[PDB]
Amino acid sequence: GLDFPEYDGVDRVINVNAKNYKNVFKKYEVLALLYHEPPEDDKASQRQFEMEELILELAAQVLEDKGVGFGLVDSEKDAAVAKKLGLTEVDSMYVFKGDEVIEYDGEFSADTIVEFLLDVLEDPVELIEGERELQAFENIEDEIKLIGYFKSKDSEHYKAFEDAAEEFHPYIPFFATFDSKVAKKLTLKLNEIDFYEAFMEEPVTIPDKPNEEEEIVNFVEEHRRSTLRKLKPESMYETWEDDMDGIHIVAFAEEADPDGFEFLETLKAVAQDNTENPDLSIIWIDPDDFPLLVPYWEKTFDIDLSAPQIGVVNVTDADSVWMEMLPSAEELEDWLEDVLE
Amino acid sequence: GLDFPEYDGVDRVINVNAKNYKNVFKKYEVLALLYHSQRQFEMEELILELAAQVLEDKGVGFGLVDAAVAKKLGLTEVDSMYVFKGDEVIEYDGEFSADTIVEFLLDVLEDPVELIEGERELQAFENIEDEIKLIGYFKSKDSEHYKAFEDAAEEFHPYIPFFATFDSKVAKKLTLKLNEIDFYEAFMEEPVTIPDKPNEEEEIVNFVEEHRRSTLRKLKPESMYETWEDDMDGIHIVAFAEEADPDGFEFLETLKAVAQDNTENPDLSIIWIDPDDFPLLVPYWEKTFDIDLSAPQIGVVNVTDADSVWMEMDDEEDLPSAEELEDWLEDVLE
CATH class of the missing domain: 3.40.30.10 (Glutaredoxin)
Structure with missing residues (x-):
């Protein structure tokens, strides 16, 4: 009774255009549209586009019984109807539930997409x-x-x-x-x-x-930004655009790890003593929640994610400086307040 | 600095033969082999191809297995992943997704x-x-x-x-x-x-x-198949409760209270499933069990018959006590 779904091969993703979009909106109570660009003249990007449909096709198959439909809108051949619906952010997925037009700001993964639409389906x-x-x-x-x-x-x-x-x-x-x-x-x-x-x-x-x-x-x-924020795969990209003068104070802490949990409790305490300063806001990233990103993070930031880390990451050029190490609640606070410009 | 890995297109999964394994076992510190519908086959290598790209510099190699070395290497289950590290063979018992396979292998790299x-x-x-x-x-x-x-x-x-x-x-x-x-x-x-x-x-x-079976166990994607296959009677007591939801959090605390007072019964071992952790299985569970997983659920699943008996709670004020749940689970005999 644990049948993990496998792809049917049946095509359920709709090619939404200016001639059928009215009837498709009547078909489904909740509609997800991948607002995409046509792949450039290089099979490097074409290979990448077909997996985007592969993820959507599985999500369409899994959520078919929930009254959820998936569609595709090209912005160089169907740019007209794309503006009428409110599709603006390019290479983004939009969810339509009644009068709601929700832009998806999370992992383009089969798991996160289905979980996100299951959260769109529940009551606000x-x-x-x-x-x-x-x-x-x-x-x-x-x-x-x-x-x-x-x-x-x-x-x-x-x-x-x-x-x-x-x-x-x-x-x-x-x-x-x-x-x-x-x-x-x-x-x-x-x-x-x-x-x-x-x-x-x-x-x-x-x-x-x-x-x-x-x-x-x-x-x-x-007040959308708190002193401590947890990076979640459903709203991961939305949290990353909320930069502070181009930098992000990022702290890595494994909640399931006692060494990471010990540092996590410190970040909780630091969030209290610095509720007064909004310029200090830490994005807590649990690497156990983003397995596909830790080799890129370790390579780019030059850190070992098996241990708790905290530092300032540049949003633009991905440069980073990291604290050397467990730190106390106070020690961490001024370590942050001595890196300003 | 938050670039999600996108597939290379470069094949890093090796087609292992009976004249290949001795050195590919030597090239990589950790080796993951997939012991393998026509279309469904090569697309589950696509999941494997992303994991090989992500774990390229971690010393992890991925391979495809021909029956001669399946004798020696110890690959037995029909379609399963086996992981080799030193003198140990780890049989993968979790989600076959790029999510959990990479996470599972990162834990295998950790010290025991x-x-x-x-x-x-x-x-x-x-x-x-x-x-x-x-x-x-x-x-x-x-x-x-x-x-x-x-x-x-x-x-x-x-x-x-x-x-x-x-x-x-x-x-x-x-x-x-x-x-x-x-x-x-x-x-x-x-x-x-x-x-x-x-x-x-x-x-x-x-x-x-x-003591591998606790009074209460949590289903995790990396070990989802390890549990539910540590099975008695062929039956499983399955509880659905969203921890992030207050309504599911409340029923979770009732499940925690049961896990303390009833280690006496050997067959009171509830599997707590958080549907927020298994989105791909939510519609399947809602159809096979005929329950809405937006609300807490608990019942007995009989894999022998694919049968299910559930508690049938109307609303939040219908959730059971610590003793009502214990009594209800006991009286389901055969």
Whole structure:
């Protein structure tokens, strides 16, 4: 009962053009489109393009029963209809669910793609009712999370909260509660929203505005970057473009390794003592989550990823300087504050 | 500085013959051989071709196996990957994907014994409960007791992590005497001491193989087939719970509570599956078992009949207690 799926050979990826795109959008509730460029006149890039379809074809086969369809849009022959749908970022995949146009910013792998669309398929807002369920919510700390207290799911405030949830779906989990006892523990007023920074226990309340739907969106985009961020294969490329003057403070730590877990607890403590400084934000990369990238990382950065590492990586030219080594919570902090320019 | 590897097109997988193996075993420190529908065959080499490109400079070579050396090398299973490192043959029992194959081989390259020095590292060691672990207190690698421990480590490498310490401060916290070895059951906090018996080495192996089944086990992609093939009755108690989801986190804590109070029953061994770790298998599980994996699930799977009996929880407030789950699993006899 562990049948790992193998490719059928059946063609399910659609060639979306200006003549059939209207009918394809009616076919599927959730539609994934690989917005691509035609391969250049060199079989070096052609070989690379067919594997992109091979990954999509497997994902189309695995998610066929979920009402998910996969398509291809060429930007030099179907550039017209590409603009009507909102396909702008080139060589990117876009997911369409109702009125949502979500750009995929993660691994172009069969596993991550299917996992990402499974997360697009779930509802943008999850409800918390029991205190036993609230305790579980508070122990999720590796990501940004928003929770609000509303009178009803038919309320105008919940629908404004749900609309903002679909804006960041499915990267940022949005939680809601109608239980007055749950809001008591969170110190949450009616229609008040709690924003939890990553790896933080104390949240912050989003200020109330007349257009609250837009307020949640701009507040999230203002606080999307935390002092400590975990690189995840689903949003890996989205986290990499959030550079700080062209550099990235990258720390490698294996969570399953006690030496890496020991350094991970240090990065957690450093995140607390430096919540005040936004210029200091560490991207924690667990190399156990990115096996295909550690030989490139070891070669480019000249480090051994079997041990905890931390340093500053240049986004442009991939240059890097790394701390020499386990460091204490304080020792790490000024090691960061003495490399500024 | 985040360039995902893209396939070269260069063939690095060697077609091994009965006049090839003696030197390709010498060219590479670690050798991974795929003991092999018409179309389905050559595309699973594409997964192998990406792994060979990624592990090009790690001393890892990939090969394809003709039946003459399958006799000598020990390749037995129908379509499986065998990994060679020194005097050991490791049979791969995980996802056949570029994700887990590269990750599995990086662990094979690791040393079989990891050392714990200092109390800060000891605390972090105790926060790892996803797998069975062993910790032994010796003096040095020169010790005769350490040699038996390290020898037992390579027979389970890299499935069972083996830990050691020469620091007396670390062993005092664990109350581990010299040459004493503690066996941590998965998701169990307090371990049991392996008895120090005349011949140490295989008593560690006999103890580990005897206790290879914990009350609660986590299905991991690199060892997915190792478990579910450590099978009794041909049946498996399968629990689905997303750790990143609060609703699944709550049911996970109920599963953890069961793993403490019920080591008495030999046949209460739940396999916790996190569907977030196996996206390619979610639609298959939802169709074979007829359950929605967005919510916690637990039930008995009978591979003999491909049958399944599930708990049928309406909503979150329908999730069972630590004792309701224990009772429900017991009354499923035949």
